[PDB]
Symmetry: C5
């Protein structure tokens, strides 16, 4: 966090890339397990002018989203907070693919399809539900209640 990025800054000013790389990598790993650091380190990576660190952190958080739906909501909001067309495409794909095998996401998506009301989102979701409903009766009654 704050002390790690401060040491990072001072080491980069001193030089010694062999130390700076390890400080950066430990920040990256701490960002994986402690998610409230993700919003920090990410915005740090942009400020240093390092596209590689920023892109790798985007990667880490995006593929961490598929194993932790709270981080999925985080990245789904962050996609709009940045206004990026890589985040806003790949998150809105991993979500509309993860909904198939994780069934509470199949309700988060149904709430987004009215809070955002995206036409393409709704037209995808209707097909998701119609494909699921014939092989999963709980999804059938879910389609009954959502109307």
């Amino acid at each position: 966090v704050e002390e790690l990025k401060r040491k990072l800054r001072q080491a980069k000013e001193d030089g010694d890339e062999e130390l700076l790389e390890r400080v950066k990598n430990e920040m990256l790993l701490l960002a994986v397990v402690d998610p409230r650091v993700l919003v920090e380190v990410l915005n740090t990576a942009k400020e240093l002018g390092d596209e590689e660190m920023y892109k790798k952190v985007k990667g880490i958080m995006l593929r961490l989203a598929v194993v932790d739906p709270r981080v999925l909501v985080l990245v789904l909001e962050l996609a709009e907070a940045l206004g990026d067309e890589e985040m806003k495409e790949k998150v809105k794909n991993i979500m509309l693919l993860l909904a198939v095998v994780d069934p509470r996401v199949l309700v988060l998506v149904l709430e987004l399809a009215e809070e955002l009301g995206d036409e393409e989102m709704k037209k995808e979701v209707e097909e998701i539900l119609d494909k699921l409903a014939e092989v999963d009766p709980r999804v059938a009654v879910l389609k009954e209640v959502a109307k």
Copy 2:
């Protein structure tokens, strides 16, 4: 949290929207991942007199509820604490829709149908239980034990 609240307030009394926007957005992002911060970020949003921040934070916590059932009690109690006709509507709806596909919430709904003891709630939950038990024998055993 305390530091971001202090920063936002001090910026607000000295102006310079370009800093206020960034601090506010980072605070919302932090609140997405740290639910303990939410009850703070919400109230501060009300204090500034900006219904837009407060409304977006209600949005964030509400759609966070459908992917983290710990928050589903937080917002459920917060609806009574505020007495807002949206929270009391949409939170009740996402419960009586999420119960279809996540039975830990189904038992929570069965407990609410007596701790609040609302007639409209129980008489609707009867339909959920019937439609599930008709096509899923485990929920039929649940209906047997809960009666």
Copy 3:
């Protein structure tokens, strides 16, 4: 919690029931999302001398149990630590209801049926297993292994 405790104390010496409601409500909500505060706010309510906040906290944590099985052990032990015939009945009921649809609890209760060894517990558990085994084939193997 310490700041909220101090604020509640300073509010109590001078009235201001609106301040009391605000601080107490923030304590209640903080207790919903940070379970290690549950035991604190519970007893602070008791020493303060208000049956209503105490019973509301008993409600909040009890219905939080059915959505977070880590708090289930907390309330199950706190029932005996208090000796309250309310907790010791309602928790011993939500377990023998929640086990029907959640199968990790179905081997938590089976540990109580020997570490407490109650006849009621063992009899009810035998009934639960006999009902589930004919409609959930996997649990049949459980009935074979728990021999």
Copy 4:
């Protein structure tokens, strides 16, 4: 924890069994929901010489495992760290019983069978796999891959 430690030490030094018992019960309850304190409080149980506190804490942290697999790995390592025959006997039973209903453990056991390499472990677990695999189709593929 340090505050509760100082309070219990002062209570022991004076000889006020009521305050000491109460604060120890509060510590026990705190240990239920903040598991990174368990190995601490357990140790304190050995420090005071209270075999009863030691046994109750062993019970709490053991039956907490069947609802939180992180505590399951904790107690699984702690059984070897202590060398207690009850911990080593009973964790290697609640695990080989929890595996039947929770499939994430079914690839935690399968890693122990080689990292600890116990002959009895593998010879017992073969029965679990062969019983599940004929009544749960995914386990058939799980057995096809792990061979």
Copy 5:
């Protein structure tokens, strides 16, 4: 961890291998139950010049991975952060065996199938999907949507 780190580093310079064993087991057990300490306890183990503590911590964290999918992503990054040929070998097998019985992992591996693009890993994933899809319709719809 920093306090236990300091105590251990002091004990290393004054002997008393029993004190060292004690602080070591303290750090190890704290690491199992609070994952953000792992990357710390690992690196210190390497710095002291004790391959055995480092190997034990690798064991513990890899074993914890199969019951905590966030540590799965942690070790999945750490594998290439070190470059070691056990993590890169064994993590890429506990994952491609855990995916069989965990539906969220089946949409984590499918992102790596392009984020690293390993042809043999893509073939492994196709084999997993083809085996699952004929005995689990959810996976059939997942295969349909993924293309």
